[PDB]
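## Example record

The block below lists the input lines for one assembly entry, exactly as stored, with component labels intact.
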Amino acid sequence: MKITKLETVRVAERTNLLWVLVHTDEGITGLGETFFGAETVETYVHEYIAPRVIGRDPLQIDLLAQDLVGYLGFRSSGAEVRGNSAFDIALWDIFGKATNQPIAQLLGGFSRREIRTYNTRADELAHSLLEDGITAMKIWPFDAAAEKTRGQYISMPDLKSALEPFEKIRKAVGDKMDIMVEFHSMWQLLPAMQIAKALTPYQTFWHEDPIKMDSLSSLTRYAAVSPAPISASETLGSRWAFRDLLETGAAGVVMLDISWCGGLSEARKIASMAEAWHLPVAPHNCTGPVVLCASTHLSLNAPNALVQESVRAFKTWYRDLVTALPEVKNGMITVPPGAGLGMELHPDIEKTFTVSRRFSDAASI
Amino acid sequence: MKITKLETVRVAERTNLLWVLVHTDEGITGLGETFFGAETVETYVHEYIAPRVIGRDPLQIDLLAQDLVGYLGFRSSGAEVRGNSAFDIALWDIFGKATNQPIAQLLGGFSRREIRTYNTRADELAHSLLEDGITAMKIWPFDAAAEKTRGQYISMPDLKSALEPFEKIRKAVGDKMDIMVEFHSMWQLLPAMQIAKALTPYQTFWHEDPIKMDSLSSLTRYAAVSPAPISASETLGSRWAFRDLLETGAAGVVMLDISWCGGLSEARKIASMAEAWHLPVAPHNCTGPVVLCASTHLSLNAPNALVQESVRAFKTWYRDLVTALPEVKNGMITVPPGAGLGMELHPDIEKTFTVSRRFSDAASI
Amino acid sequence: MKITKLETVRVAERTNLLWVLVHTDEGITGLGETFFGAETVETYVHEYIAPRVIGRDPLQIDLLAQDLVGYLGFRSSGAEVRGNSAFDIALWDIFGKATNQPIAQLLGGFSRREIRTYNTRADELAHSLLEDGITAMKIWPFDAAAEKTRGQYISMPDLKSALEPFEKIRKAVGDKMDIMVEFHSMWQLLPAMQIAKALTPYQTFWHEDPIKMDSLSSLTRYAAVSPAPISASETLGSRWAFRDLLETGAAGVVMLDISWCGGLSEARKIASMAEAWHLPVAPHNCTGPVVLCASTHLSLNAPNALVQESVRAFKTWYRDLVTALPEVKNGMITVPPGAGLGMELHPDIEKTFTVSRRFSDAASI
Amino acid sequence: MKITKLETVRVAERTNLLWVLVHTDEGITGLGETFFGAETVETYVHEYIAPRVIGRDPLQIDLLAQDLVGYLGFRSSGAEVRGNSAFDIALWDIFGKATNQPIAQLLGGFSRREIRTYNTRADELAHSLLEDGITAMKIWPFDAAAEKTRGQYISMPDLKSALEPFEKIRKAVGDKMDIMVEFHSMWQLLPAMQIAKALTPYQTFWHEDPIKMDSLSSLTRYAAVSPAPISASETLGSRWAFRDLLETGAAGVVMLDISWCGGLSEARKIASMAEAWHLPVAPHNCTGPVVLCASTHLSLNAPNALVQESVRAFKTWYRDLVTALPEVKNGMITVPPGAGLGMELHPDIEKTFTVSRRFSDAASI
Ligand code: NA
Ligand code: NA
Ligand code: NA
Ligand code: NA
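Predicted C-alpha cells for the full assembly:
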C-alpha cells in the first residue's frame, strides 16, 4: 500500500493537542498524536513530512523514521521531532490494522497483560488513590519556589514549606505509597542538590528532571547526593540523547514521551537499550489519549517497563475524542482491544469540539 | 520602549528564508533572519514568541533570550530555536539603533576592522579565488558517495574519485590555498575515519561535520585519526551543546550559525567560551544577507574569530532584499556602515519578490 | 575618540584603594578601581599600561583587554592584572557615557532591577540583619585558629569554639538566615575537610576559599566531603582560571572580583560560562565603592547572578569618595542612576582626604 | 643575624633589570635579581616585602618564602612573585656567605662541576657554535607569523618560510646540533599543533611554550601530535603550577626561571619533583647576570638538570654590572668561585651606568 493523504486535526478546546492521520490507498488510516505547539507542528507536517511521504509505503517504518531525521532539529524534542513522532505512531497503527494485530504484539508481544499505573489536599489524595489500588503518586511542590528565583535559589523556609506535602502523605499512609517528585527541569544544579538532600527523610521514589537536560554530564554530581534515582527525561529526543544519558553513569529511571522522542520507533529502541543498563523505562502520559494508549502498548511489551502514568479518572474529554480508551482496574492499566492502537477519532467530533483540519495529498505537495 | 508588533516576511522566490521584524512604540524596527522551514518557524513566531514579547522592553536582551527557552526543543537547531534566534538578532539591531552603535561595538568593540573570508572545475575555481585575494575554499566532494549508502560505506574506487578535486587544486595552486572539507554530517563513524585518513596527503584545513552531531563523544575517536581539526557545528544549538562539544576533548574549529544556535546572544557566549579552550570560532553563512551581516559583526568583535564565510559575488538577489550589504575587498569582509546591522529590508521588495507577511500585535495575541 | 591621559588617585586614609581615571579627547573620563598593593599597581599603570594605551580608541574594549595580557603574571590576581582590571572598568564607564547607557545595559540588559544582597555578637547581628530584610550573612570564625598553626591543624576544642557562632545564630533566627562561611584560603586540605564535616549540623550555605586556590584539583576531595558547595574564588584571575575550576568537577558558587580577575570584560565571560555549567555567580565587594557599583551592574545583567555582597550601612567614607552609590532597600541592592557606572569621584575630595595623583600622557610615555 | 635594610637598584641602560640587596646587621649583603617591570617590582619590594622582613632572621629561608606568599598574585609570574624571587635569591647569597659555601653546596652539593650550555644567518650561526663546542641552539622563527594573526592562524606559505632556518641548519651541520624551538606562548592550540606536525622532519629537540600556559590541560592534545617534548615553562610560578603541569600527563622538559617562579626556594623543589616524574629541568637565563649565576648553581646541584642556557659571549655589559661571572669553556658552564653566588655588584657602577637606588629600613617602614 501507499500513503495518499496526510491530515492534521486540532480542537479549539484543547489547544496543545495535534492529531496526525495517515491515509492510504487501501483505506487504512493511521492515527498519531503529539502535544505542545500544535499549530507549529501542524505547519511542519504539511511543509516537511507531506512532500517526503505521499506515495511511500507506510510499512517501511524504520526507513521512514530515518528519512524524516532533519539536518537541523535532531536529537531534541522540538517541533520537527514532535511531528515526526506523531507520524510514526500513525504508521504503527496502520501496521497493526494491516496485520490485525495490536501494537504491543508487533513490538514483540504482550510481556504482561496489564501494568501498574500512577497518578499525578495531599494526604486526602494519597488515601483515595490507595483505596482504588493505586500505590504511586507524583507531585511537584517545588515549582512555585523555582518560579520565584528562576531556579537559582531556594530559601530554607520555602524549602520547609515545600516539604510539607511529603510529611502529610507519610503521616496519612506511611510506607504504602511510592512518592515520585517532579521538578520540571526548573532548578540550577546547586539548589537541585540542596533540595535532593532535604528530601532524604521522605523515602522518595524518583526525582524527575531535577535540572535542565541540556548538558547531561551535570547529572553525575546530582546523583552523587540524591537519595532517589534520577528520572530522566520526557524532554530528551532520539536514542542518541539516551546514549548520552546512559554514558553519564548517573541514569536511573529512563523516562520518555513517545510523541516527543521520535515515536514508538525510537522509544522501543531506547527501552531495550535501557534494559542493557539494568534500568527501567516509564513512558510519559497525561497529555492526549492516543499517547496514553500507544504508551500502554509499549509498556505491555517492554520487559523493563516499570509503570505507565495515567490521568486520574480519564470521565474526561478523552472519551469524547476517541472511540475507546485504555482501561484502569485496581491500579493497573491495559490497552483497548483490537488491531493497531485499538482506537480511532470519535465519529463526528465536530459535535463536541471546534475542529480544524488540514490536508496534504499528491496535488498539494 | 516596548515591543508593539511582530512581523514575519517570506518570499516565494527563496522559500528557505524567513525575516522577523520587531516593531516598537519608538518606531525602531529590528530585523532578524533565519533559514530552513520558513513556514514552520513563522507559525512558531506568532504562536509562541508573540504572546510572550508584545509589550516587553526589547533592551532586556539576555532576559528575553532566557524567557524564550522552551520546555521542549531546547539545546537544538529546531524550529523553536530558529525562531528565537531570528528574534534575538532583531533585538540586537534595535539595541544598535537605540544607541547609534553598530552591533560589533555593542558586543565589546571592533577588535578588527575586517576579517578574512572563504568561499564554497575545482582547479580553475581555486585559481580565480586566489587572484581575488581569497585564500581558503570549502568543498564537499564526498556527499554523492554518502547518499549512495546512507553514509554506511564508501568503496575505495569511490573514495579515490572523491579525492580528485584535492589533487587538482594542489596541482594548480599548491600550498597557497587552505582547503576546508564539508561532510554535511552524512557519514557514520567508520567510513568517516576511513575518509579522514585518506585525506592526509592533501593538507586539509578542517573537517566539518564529519558525522552526525547527536552523541558528541563519538568525536574523540574521529579526532584520534583525523589529519585535520574537526569543525563543529552549525547544527548545534545553545552554549550547552558547545559545552558538551568542548568536554569531549576533541573540539577544533568551533562553528555555529547565529540563526540556528540561539542568536547573537548565545553565539557571543559560545565564542568567548571557545577562546577559553584556545580554539577559534567561524560563524556560518551562505544563507541569507542578514545572517551574513550579523555574523560579520560577531566576527569583527570576537578576538578568536578565524574567518567569516561568504557567498562568492553576493550581484545576487541579496542586493534586492536589503538596503546595504557587507563588502568584500581583497579577500576580507567588513560590515556595512551604520547603527545596528547597518541594513534594512529593501523598500518595496514587493516589486522584485512575491512577498507574504504576517503580523501579531496586542489585539491578536 | 582617543585616550589622552591616564590618571591614578590614592588617598592616605584608605591605603589599599587605587582609582584609575582614563581621560579622552572627547572629555569623557572613565573611572575604575582596584584594591591591595595600591602603590605597586599605580607604578604598573604608568610603567606598562600608559605607553600601550595613550592614543588608542577606548571603545575597542575586548581588543584592549587582549593587548594588556602580560607575557608574565597572567591567569592571576597579581599587580598587573589588578591594574588591567581597574583600567577595564574605566573603559566600560566611558562606553556607557558615550552611549548614554548604564553598564548593565551594555552587558546585555537589566535582567533584574535589583538583586538580593548579603553582609559580612553573632546572634544579635543576625537578628538585626533579618529585620532589615537581609537574609544572608558571611562569617569567618576559623581564621584565628588557622593563624595559630598556619592552617596545618585544628584542635577539637578550637574547632568546637569556632562552631559556637553557628549555634548562636541558629538558636536566634533558626532557618531564616543563610550562613556563608569564609575561610580566606587559610587551611591545608586535611583540616579543611575536617572543618567542613564538622559544619554539617549548621546547614551552611557555601564554603568559600576553604584551601589555597593554586592547584585546583585538590578541590575534588574537598567537595567529596563538604556539606555545602565550594565558593571559589575572588583570588582567581581570567576566564582560563575559571575553566580550570570548572574542569575539576567540584565547582559550586563561582566567585570573582572584577578588579582582581581581568575586569568586567573577563567577569562577564566567566559568568556566562558558569551558567553553561548550571552554576551561579557572586561578585565580590566590601572593598571600594566603584567595585561595588560595577559589580552591581554585572549582577543586574547576568542571569545567573545569585547575590551581590555589600557593606553594612555603606554612612561610611564611601559617600565622601564618589558622587553617588548603589542603594540598598529591604535587603536588595541596585545601581545608582545614569550612564556608565552612574558615579564619579566626589568633587574636591582633597577636602576630606589626603589625595595623591599621578598622570601619564603623550609627552611622558 | 637580622635584616636591616632592603635596597633596590636599577640602571637606565637596562630598564628590564632590577637588583635587590638585602643588608644585615652582620654586614653580609645578599644580592638578588629579577627581570621585567623593574619599576613595578621595585615599588612592591618597598611597599610589601620591606615591612615584613626588616628585623627578621634571613637564615629562615623556607619560612620567609612562606611569609611572602600573597593572598593575591600567587601561583604566577606576576610582579609580587618576581619581587619575592629576587629577595629569595639574595637570602641564598647571604646563607652562602654566612657559611663560606657556594649556593650549589647549600642546595645539596655539586652533583657536577660544569654543565652543558646552549645559546639562542642560521646555518653560519650553527657552524660557529659547534666549533666552540656548543651543540644546542634555540630559535624562534615563528614569532613574526604569530604576530600577524595574534596566533590564530598560519598560512602554509608562511609556515614553509618559517621552516627554512631548520633546513639551513640541517644542511650545514646535520645531526650534530640539537635545535630547540621557542614559541613564546604566541599560538592558539590548532595552529600550534599544525606547526608541531610540520616540524617533524627536522628532529627538533624541544618545543617551548607552544601555547599560553594558562589552562594547562590543553597541553595533552598538543603532546598527542608533537614530534618533540613540550618545554614548559619559564612563565609558570610556584611548585603548585608545576604540580598542575605534571598532572596533565604531557610534561616534558621542565623549564623555570628562578626570578619568576618563587626563587631558588621554589625552583629547587620543582626540580626534585620533576625528577620524581623522570623528567629533566632547564633553568632559564639570557636575562641578567645574577639569574644566570644562581641558575648555574641550581644546575650544578640538581641531578636532573639537563642544560643551562646562557648568552653568547656574555664581553657584554654583564661584566660591568658584577664582579665575576660564570665561565663557559668548550660548551660547558660553571659558577664563579666563592661563597654564595660568587659575585657582587661591581664597585662604583655609577661610572658605567645611570644608577637609581631606593632604600627601606626600620625608620621608613
Ligand atoms: Na514530567
Ligand atoms: Na557547513
Ligand atoms: Na572572600
Ligand atoms: Na623561553
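DSSP finds 13 helices and 14 strands in chain C. The two ends of chain C are 19 Å apart (CA to CA).
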